[PDB]
């Protein structure tokens, strides 16, 4: 969140409040404790260009995938999530892009759906079953994926 809003205020400074920014981002609350992190971010310049390039393909991508999948044999839970989609998303004209353009806005879109989902479901994790808070020594077992 901090890496995105620090790029809007670089292009147009009147849109982001600096005092509102570092009051809700630099504090991390977990396990009843508050960790003030240290930020002066060229690490996250791969995600913010993948998560925002996915940000515009989803409102077209969920209407184009619903207008093709309409039939008597529709799965019944998709009738429920037919209303969670907003009003403005259901006003997109899909005729303004050519048929060879609507292929390359899915194959590009499905690759930023999976490869962004895969790196957060990576499993080089390890399960701690004993920890001593003053010796700092912890037993565990490794578990890949």
């Amino acid at each position: 969140v901090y890496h995105i809003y620090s790029k809007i205020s670089a292009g147009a400074p009147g849109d982001v409040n600096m005092a509102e920014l570092d009051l809700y981002t630099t504090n991390v609350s977990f396990m009843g404790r508050t960790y003030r992190l240290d930020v002066d971010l060229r690490v996250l310049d791969d995600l913010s260009m993948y998560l925002c390039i996915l940000s515009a393909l989803v409102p077209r991508g969920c209407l184009r995938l619903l207008t093709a999948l309409v039939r008597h044999d529709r799965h019944p839970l998709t009738e429920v999530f037919e209303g969670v989609v907003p009003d403005e998303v259901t006003r997109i004209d899909l005729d303004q892009l050519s048929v060879p353009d609507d292929i390359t806005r899915m194959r590009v879109m499905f690759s930023y759906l999976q490869s962004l989902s895969s790196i957060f479901n990576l499993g080089p994790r390890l399960h701690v079953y004993a920890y001593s808070a003053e010796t700092l020594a912890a037993s565990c077992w490794y578990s890949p994926r």
Binding site: T67, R71, E79, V80, E82, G83, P86, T90, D93, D95
Partner: protein, 179 residues
């Protein structure tokens, strides 16, 4: 009757108006439309006194089980430059995906436009509903002579009638511009 309200959300923004049409069995018996759930409908309009082609839109059709009874549809009406033409055919093409079936059903706008005449952020949840009441108005097809019904659903609206732009002289006779 769900097949009207589905098309107002997905066929709706790609059109100008929808002609909500219910076809009784008397219309179905003449054109021999065998109501299986596999049938994929498709609609496009054939213009007059202009370059005649519009885009094909796939329209959902569901059988109504019983106050009429028959196949329910929704026909797209296209207003190029802000008005409707009276003599403008809206073509319905009926076909099955696997087997061999191809039917053409055609409707004219004067049998349709006349029949229309009488803190955490909250997310909006708009399901498809049959809450809106129907008004059933009679119509007769010009091409076969079989009656069909037109739904007018409740919603510069009550002030104006629905626009038409009648053809001008010189003109062929309207029995020869219809066909």
């Amino acid at each position: 009757m769900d097949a009207h309200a589905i098309n107002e959300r997905y066929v709706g923004p790609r059109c100008h108006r929808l002609a909500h049409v219910v076809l009784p069995r008397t219309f179905l018996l003449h054109h021999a439309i065998p109501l299986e759930p596999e049938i994929i409908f498709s609609t496009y309009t054939r213009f007059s006194r202009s370059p005649g082609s519009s885009r094909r839109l796939v329209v959902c059709g569901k059988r109504v089980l019983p106050s009429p009874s028959g196949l329910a549809l929704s026909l797209p009406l296209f207003s190029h430059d802000g008005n409707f033409h009276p003599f403008d055919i809206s073509v319905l093409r009926i076909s099955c995906p696997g087997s061999n079936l191809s039917l053409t059903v055609r409707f004219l706008y004067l049998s349709l436009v006349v029949a229309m005449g009488a803190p955490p952020v909250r997310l909006s949840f708009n399901p498809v509903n049959a809450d809106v009441p129907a008004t059933w108005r009679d119509a007769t097809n010009v091409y076969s002579g079989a009656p069909y019904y037109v739904c007018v659903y409740e919603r510069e609206d009550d002030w104006l009638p629905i626009p038409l732009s009648f053809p001008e002289e010189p003109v062929p006779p309207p029995p020869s511009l219809v066909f």
